[PDB]
Design a protein around this ligand. Structure first.
Ligand SMILES: NC(=O)c1ccc[n+]([C@@H]2O[C@H](COP(=O)([O-])OP(=O)(O)OC[C@H]3O[C@@H](n4cnc5c(N)ncnc54)[C@H](O)[C@@H]3O)[C@@H](O)[C@H]2O)c1
Ligand SMILES: NC(=O)c1ccc[n+]([C@@H]2O[C@H](COP(=O)([O-])OP(=O)(O)OC[C@H]3O[C@@H](n4cnc5c(N)ncnc54)[C@H](O)[C@@H]3O)[C@@H](O)[C@H]2O)c1
Ligand SMILES: NC(=O)c1ccc[n+]([C@@H]2O[C@H](COP(=O)([O-])OP(=O)(O)OC[C@H]3O[C@@H](n4cnc5c(N)ncnc54)[C@H](O)[C@@H]3O)[C@@H](O)[C@H]2O)c1
Ligand SMILES: NC(=O)c1ccc[n+]([C@@H]2O[C@H](COP(=O)([O-])OP(=O)(O)OC[C@H]3O[C@@H](n4cnc5c(N)ncnc54)[C@H](O)[C@@H]3O)[C@@H](O)[C@H]2O)c1
Ligand SMILES: NC(=O)c1ccc[n+]([C@@H]2O[C@H](COP(=O)([O-])OP(=O)(O)OC[C@H]3O[C@@H](n4cnc5c(N)ncnc54)[C@H](O)[C@@H]3O)[C@@H](O)[C@H]2O)c1
Ligand SMILES: NC(=O)c1ccc[n+]([C@@H]2O[C@H](COP(=O)([O-])OP(=O)(O)OC[C@H]3O[C@@H](n4cnc5c(N)ncnc54)[C@H](O)[C@@H]3O)[C@@H](O)[C@H]2O)c1
Lengths: 167, 167, 167, 167, 167, 167
C-alpha cells in the first residue's frame, strides 16, 4: 500500500509534517513529490528543489520517521495539465492512493481514475507556504510555523536574505 | 561529506551496485541521480524513471545499505550541456565530490570547478547497460548481470516483453 | 478561396457558430483553428482540445454545414508571438483571408502581410467564452449561450462538474 | 465506434489509403492523426503538417469517403514516450480501437490499456514513406505509389524540388 | 576588464544610454545583453529582439561610442532562474563585473559569486520602459525619454501603431 | 544594403574569414549569426556561443574589419525548420540578401522569398569545421586552418583539451 502526496514545499512547514505523519498511519509507504522542481528565486517559489530536498530530509529524519517509509522525488511542472498525472506516474513507483488538498491535483487524479482523499487540515490559516513566506518578508513569526530542522536549513542557505532581497 | 553519482541506470546492474558500495566507504552520503528521467520505451532507455527508482530502492535495500546514506533523485536531460551541471545542483543537496566514469559528465563538472574521480570499473565488458539490454533482446544471460531484486522488478513490469516488442 | 479563423473555443458558443456561418458566405472553405490546444483544466481553458474538437464537430454538423467546407485543426500556443503566424501556416492548408476580432491575432497577421477582417459581433456581452464560463460557475443561464449539441457534449464530459471543482 | 490511426504521412501513399478504407469497414469513424506535425524540410519528414493535411483531404475526398467519417488532426511529437498516449487523447475525440503497424505505437497504447490491432499490410515493400521518398530523390517511379491527388499536391508545393535540394 | 549589463530594452531609453556611458568609464568593454529576446508584441515587451538590436546600434553609434567597446547579445529568457546566470555565461564573452538595478538579476549573480553593482539611477520616474510604453499608449511625451535615433527606429517599424493596436 | 550569413562557427576558420571579407565587398553590413548557440561540449559543437563570440571578435578585429560593418548575433536552434527563418528575423536587424553554402539554409530562405546566394568556397577540403575538429582530435595540423587570433582563444579556453577529453 503506497500513497502519493505532492506539494511545492515552499518551504516545508508543520502543516506538511503533521499531514505526512497522519497519512503514514494508513499507508506502508508515502511517495512525497516536490512539485515545481524547476522554479526558484521568486516570491511564490523561493527555494530550489535541491534545497527543499534538504528540508524534507532533515525534518522527517529529525522526527524519527524511517527513511525507507517514503520517497522524496522532485517533479518539474509541465505546460499540459492533461499530461501531468502521466508525468508523475512516469517519475514515481506505483501508488494506490492520492492524498491532496489541492483542487487541481484532486481533479486531475480523480479524472484519471485514482482514489483521492483530502486529509484534515492543521491550522490552515498558519500552516501554509503563503503565510510562512509572508512572515519571512514582513518580519513576522515564521520560525514557529516550521520544524526546527527546516529553520536551520533556511538559515544555512540564507533563505530569508534571498527572499527579502528579491522583494 | 556527500558524493554525487549520475547514471541512466537502464537498468541498474551489478556494476552500479559494486561501485556504489565502494564510494560509500569514502563518503558519508551518496546522491544517486537517475539521468534521462524523461526517456523511456526506446532501445537505449527502455525503463521509465519511476521504474528505475523501484530498481535502485529494491537493490540497495536488499543489500543492507541504510536508506539514509543516499538520495535517489531523477533528473531529466536538457538540451544545453553548459547548463547541465547547474541543472543537477538545482535539484540536489550540496555535494563535495563527483564520481563518474562518463567522459562528458567528468568534463562538465571538472570545468565547473568540482573534484571528479573515476572509480575502478567492475567487469566493464559485462556490467554495462548496453550489454544487459543486448542480452535481454538476444536471449543471452542477462539475469547474471543484475541483482536479484532488479530481476524481480524487471519481471513485474514486463521489461523484457516491452524491450523485445519495441525491437 | 479559403479563410482562416482562430479561437480558444472555451467552449464553442453561439457567437462562434453565427460568425462561422457568416464567413462561409464569402469563402469556399474555412480553416477553423482551435487555439491553446495544449491547455486544459484551468478557469480560462477548462476543456481539452480533443473535447473542443467534439464540440465543433457536433455543433457544425447539427447545423447542416457540410464537413467538407471546413478544417478543425488544433494549434498549441507558442512562447514567441513573432513565430505564431508561421506556426499556424505550418499546420494548415493555404489561406487567403484571416477573420478575427482578437487584437493580437489581427496585428500579427496584418504585419505578416495578410488581409485581416473583423466580422460584426453577435451579442458580444453574452456570446463570449468569459461570460459562458462565468455562468457555469455561478449557476447562471449558460445553456442559452451554446448550441444544444455543445451543451450535450459539456454534460457528457462533466464540464460543469470539472470547472466548479477547480474553482 | 471510433478508431484511431497515426502516421507521419510523409507523404500520404496508397498504403495509407488502402488501410484506411479497410478500417472504415469495421469502425463508424476513424481519427487520422498526422504525426510529427512540427517537423518539415528533412529527408525523413519533408512536408509540413499543413501540406500533409491537404494531401489527406484531396486523396480521401477524391476516393468518395465522406468527410464526416474521419478526423484529420496534426499532432506534434513530444520528448516523453510515456506521455505520448496522453498527448494523443488530449487532442482527439474519444476512441475505442487503435490501428497500427508501428511497434512503438502499438506498445504504448497496449500498455495504457487500449486494444490495438495491426491490419494486413499492402505491398509493404512499395507502399512506405521511405520507399516513396527514395524514389523521389533517385528519380524512380514514385507517382505509382501515390494517389493521383497526392501527386498533384506534391507538384503544387514543389515537393520533389525541395527534397532534392535538401539532399 | 569587461562588464555586463542586461535589460529588456523595451525600448532603449535615455536611462540606458546614460548608465551605459557611465559604466564605460570604469570598464574597457561592456557586454550589453538584450533580455527577453523571444518576447514581442505584448504591452510589456512590444518590440522584437531584432528591432531592439537596431535601437541600441543606432543610439550608441550616434553617441560616438566606438562599436568595439561593447557587445549587443540577445538572450532568450528561460524557465529556471537557477540556470539563468549559466545561460548568460554560455552566450557571452567572459566578464568580471555585473551592473544591475534589477533585484532578481543582482541576487542571481550575487549568489553565483559575481561582484554586482547598482549604478546611480537617472530620473527613475521618467527613464523606465514602463513609463515610455505608457506615454506611447496614452499620447504622452515619450519622444523626450528616448535618444533621437531610437525615436527614428520606432517610427520606421511603426512601434506606436503596433502597441496601440494590441491595447 | 545588409547581408546575412549563418554558421555554427565550430570553430571560426579561415574559410569563414575569407568568405566574410568577400561578402563585405558587395554589402554595407553583414549580420553574422552564430548558429546552435545552445549547443556545446559535443564532437560536433565543442565550443559555447560565448566562446565563439570571442573568436569572431578577435579574428575580425585583427583583420582590420571595422566592428560597425557587422553584427555577431547568437541564435539557438529550434525544432521547427518551418519557423527557423522567422526565428532569425525575430532576432536580427532587417536584411536584403542571404549568403549560404548550406542546402537547408538556402532552401528555407529561398522558400520564404529571400534572394540567397552561394559564394565560391575556399579550400572546401581544408576550411571546414569538420576537418578542423578532426585534426584537433587526431593531432593533425589544425592551427594552419584558423586565423592566429582564433588559435589564441582556443588555447585560452583549453579547447583541444576539452574536445580530446570528451572523445
Ligand atoms: N501541470 C502541472 O505542471 C501541474 C498541475 C497541478 C499541480 N502541479 C504542482 O503541484 C504543486 C502545488 O502543490 P500545492 O500548491 O498544493 O503545495 P503546498 O506545499 O502548498 O501544499 C501541498 C499539499 O500539502 C497538504 N497540506 C499543506 N498544508 C497543510 C496543512 N496545514 N494541513 C494539512 N495538509 C496540508 C495539502 O494536501 C496540499 O495540497 C506545484 O509544484 C504545482 O506546480 C503541477
Ligand atoms: N545535457 C544533458 O542533459 C546531459 C549531459 C551529460 C550527461 N547526462 C546524463 O547522464 C546519464 C548518462 O549516464 P551514463 O551513460 O554514464 O549511465 P550508466 O548507467 O551507463 O553509467 C553511470 C555511471 O555508473 C558508473 N558505472 C557503470 N557501470 C559500472 C561498472 N561496471 N563498474 C563501475 N562503475 C560503473 C560510471 O561512473 C558511469 O558513468 C544520462 O541520463 C545522460 O542523459 C545529461
Ligand atoms: N503566441 C501564441 O501562442 C499566440 C498569439 C495569438 C493568439 N493565440 C491564440 O489565439 C487563441 C485566442 O483566441 P480568442 O481569445 O480570440 O478566442 P475566442 O474563442 O474567445 O474568440 C475567437 C474569435 O471568434 C470570434 N468571435 C468570438 N465570439 C464572437 C461573437 N460573439 N460574435 C462574433 N465573432 C465572435 C472573434 O473573431 C474571436 O477573435 C488562443 O488559443 C491563443 O492562445 C496564440
Ligand atoms: N513520443 C512521441 O512523440 C512519439 C511516440 C510514437 C510515435 N510517434 C509518431 O508516430 C508517427 C510515426 O508513424 P509511422 O512511422 O508509423 O508513419 P507511417 O506514415 O510510415 O505509417 C503510419 C501507419 O500506417 C499504416 N501503414 C503504412 N503503410 C502501410 C501499408 N503499405 N499497408 C498498410 N498499412 C500501412 C501502419 O499502421 C503504420 O504504422 C510519427 O509522427 C512519430 O513521431 C511519436
Ligand atoms: N530566468 C530568466 O529567464 C531571467 C531571470 C532574470 C532576469 N531576466 C531578464 O532580465 C531582463 C529584465 O531586465 P530589466 O527588467 O531590468 O530591464 P530594463 O530595460 O527595464 O532595465 C535594465 C537595467 O538597466 C538599468 N537602467 C534602466 N533604467 C535606468 C535608468 N533610468 N537609470 C539608470 N540605470 C537604468 C538598470 O540596471 C536595469 O536593471 C528581461 O529580459 C528578463 O526576462 C531573465
Ligand atoms: N531549425 C533550425 O534550428 C535550423 C535550420 C537550419 C540551420 N540551422 C543552423 O545553421 C547552422 C549550421 O551552419 P553550417 O552547418 O553551415 O555551419 P558552418 O560554420 O560549417 O558553415 C557556415 C557557412 O559558412 C560558409 N563557409 C564555411 N566554410 C567555408 C569555406 N571554406 N569557404 C567559403 N564559405 C564557407 C558557408 O556559407 C556555410 O554554410 C547551425 O547552427 C544549425 O543548427 C538551424
Amino acid at each position: 500500500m503506497r500513497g502519493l502526496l505532492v506539494g511545492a514545499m515552499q518551504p516545508f512547514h508543520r502543516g506538511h509534517l503533521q499531514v505526512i505523519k497522519s497519512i503514514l498511519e494508513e499507508v506502508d509507504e508515502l511517495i512525497i513529490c516536490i512539485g515545481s522542481a524547476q522554479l526558484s528565486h521568486s516570491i511564490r517559489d523561493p527555494f530550489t528543489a535541491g534545497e527543499r530536498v534538504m528540508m524534507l530530509t532533515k525534518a522527517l529524519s529529525e522526527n524519527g520517521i524511517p527513511a525507507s517509509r517514503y520517497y522524496i522525488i522532485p517533479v518539474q511542472d509541465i505546460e499540459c495539465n492533461a499530461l501531468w498525472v502521466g508525468h508523475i506516474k512516469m517519475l514515481t513507483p506505483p501508488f494506490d492512493r492520492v492524498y491532496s488538498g489541492n483542487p487541481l491535483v484532486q481533479r486531475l487524479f480523480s479524472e484519471d481514475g485514482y482514489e483521492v482523499t483530502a486529509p484534515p487540515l492543521f491550522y490552515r490559516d498558519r500552516y501554509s507556504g503563503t503565510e510562512v513566506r509572508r512572515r519571512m518578508l514582513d518580519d513576522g513569526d515564521w520560525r514557529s510555523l516550521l520544524p526546527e530542522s527546516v529553520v536551520e536549513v533556511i538559515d544555512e542557505i540564507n533563505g530569508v536574505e534571498r527572499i527579502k532581497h528579491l522583494a
